[PDB]
Structure formats: structure tokens, C-alpha cells
Amino acid sequence: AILNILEFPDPRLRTIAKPVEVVDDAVRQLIDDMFETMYEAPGIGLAATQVNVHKRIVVMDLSEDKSEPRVFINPEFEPLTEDMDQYQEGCLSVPGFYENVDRPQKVRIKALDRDGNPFEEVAEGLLAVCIQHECDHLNGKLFVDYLSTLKRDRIRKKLEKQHRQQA
Amino acid sequence: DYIRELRAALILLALKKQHAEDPDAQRVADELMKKLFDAAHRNDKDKVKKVVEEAKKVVST
Ligand SMILES: CCCCC[C@H](CC(=O)NO)C(=O)N[C@H](C(=O)N1CCC[C@H]1CO)C(C)C
Numbered sequence A: 001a002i003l004n005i006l007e008f009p010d011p012r013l014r015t016i017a018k019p020v021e022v023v024d025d026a027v028r029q030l031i032d033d034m035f036e037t038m039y040e041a042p043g044i045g046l047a048a049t050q051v052n053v054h055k056r057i058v059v060m061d062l063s064e065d066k067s068e069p070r071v072f073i074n075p076e077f078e079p080l081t082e083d084m085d086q087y088q089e090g091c092l093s094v095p096g097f098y099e100n101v102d103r104p105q106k107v108r109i110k111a112l113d114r115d116g117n118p119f120e121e122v123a124e125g126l127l128a129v130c131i132q133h134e135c136d137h138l139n140g141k142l143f144v145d146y147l148s149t150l151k152r153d154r155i156r157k158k159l160e161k162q163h164r165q166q167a
Numbered sequence B: 001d002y003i004r005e006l007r008a009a010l011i012l013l014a015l016k017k018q019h020a021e022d023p024d025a026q027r028v029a030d031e032l033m034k035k036l037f038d039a040a041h042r043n044d045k046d047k048v049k050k051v052v053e054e055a056k057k058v059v060s061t
């Protein structure tokens, strides 16, 4: 099913997600809905926080043919470089805005897979950006938090106006 | 629709950039993404529609 995506400045996006303790079929059903929502948006990743489910679950697909859907449960990342790279990021919870964010582009990922089993992965390039963006969401962080005060406020006021029309 | 087209084009170019070995393919991808960003920042739907169509072709190459 398609889930509703929360949008900045909704305060529920600031919730810190709780770890998943059991990877049951109810978790896999949520993952399946997260993928459907992501593919339809479209986006290349999604965190459960964004669909108002405050559990530590991230989905992703960086394949051109939708052949490599990836699941990250209770994800953590650790930089493997002090080098910083820029990437112009957008966010389905900050729709319509694309801004440069500085992040390490080499990290180690630790998480549980779709069966609940642990794994580790070294990530570079877009996968390194995406996992940091998605983990940020699980910690209640949005990419606009890296921007200047005035740029963030212009984005907030623009979205608040769009939302007033939505209601 | 328009928004989905813009997003899908950005995704396509970003993945081509990531998976490309030739830095000239990466440059071309980055250039089309910048035009999309600039057109979408101005809500210039006409240029966005034109750039999306060019992006689809350069990816068919
Ligand atoms: C790069 C880190 C982005 C993580 C995924 C986001 C979706 C999201 O909000 N995840 O939390 C996305 O797909 N964003 C898209 C996006 O910004 N992209 C997709 C390819 C790379 C980048 C554009 O430079 C837009 C177009 C919906």
C-alpha cells in the first residue's frame, strides 16, 4: 500500500525512532509498503520516520532497473575518511528543494537485513550519501538542518504556505 | 506528471553518474542535473520538460 509521507515542518519528523527488536512479518509488510511508497514517489530511499512509523528501518534501491532493493534495519554508519564531498540532495519530506550538503563519501554500514541477521558493508558514492540521509531521519534530522538559518527559514515558510493551501 | 518526471529524471542521471566509469559520462550527467535544479528552482516548467526529454535521450546513448 502507498503510505503518506510527512513533510517539514511537521514535528513528527523530529521523533527519534526506536530500534526494531523482532523482524517479523509485520515488519516485512511495513518494508513492502515503504518500497511501494518509495518507488511511486519516486525516490531512491525511505526511512520509516517519514511515513510516521518511528522504528529504525530504512529501504533503498540504487539500481537502474529496480533489481537491488535493499533493507537496513537498526542501521548505523561510521565514516572511513575525513574527506568531505558535496552532494545536491532533495528529500521527499522537503519536497521541491535541492541543496548541497557536505558529507563523508566513504562509510561503514552496520545493520540487520530483511531476515534480522547482522551484516556490515563499506559504502562509497551515492550509497554513502543515502545511508547518512536516511539515518539522519531516524535521529530526527533533515538535510535542511545543515543549511544556513535564512535558507532553512525560507524553505520552512514556503512549505508552511503550501500546507495551508493543502488544508 | 511533471513532478514525478522531474524526480525520475534526477534519479536516472544520479544513477548514471554513480555507475559510469567514463568521467565524460559523469560530466554530462552532472550538467543535466544542474539544469534541472536551476529550472525547478524557478518553477520554469517549460525548461524542465525540455531538459527531462534531453536526459532520457542521453541515457539511451
Ligand atoms: C541523495 C540522498 C537522497 C535520499 C533519498 C531521497 C528520498 C528521501 O527523502 N529519503 O529520505 C531522494 O530520493 N531524493 C531525490 C534526490 O534528491 N536525488 C535522487 C538522486 C540523487 C538526488 C538528486 O541529486 C529526489 C529527486 C526525490
Ligand SMILES: [K+]
Pocket (backbone or CB within 6 Å): A097, A098, A099, B037, B038, B040, B041
Ligand atoms: K534548488
Ligand SMILES: [Zn+2]
Pocket (backbone or CB within 6 Å): A090, A091, A092, A093, A133, A137
Ligand atoms: Zn529524506
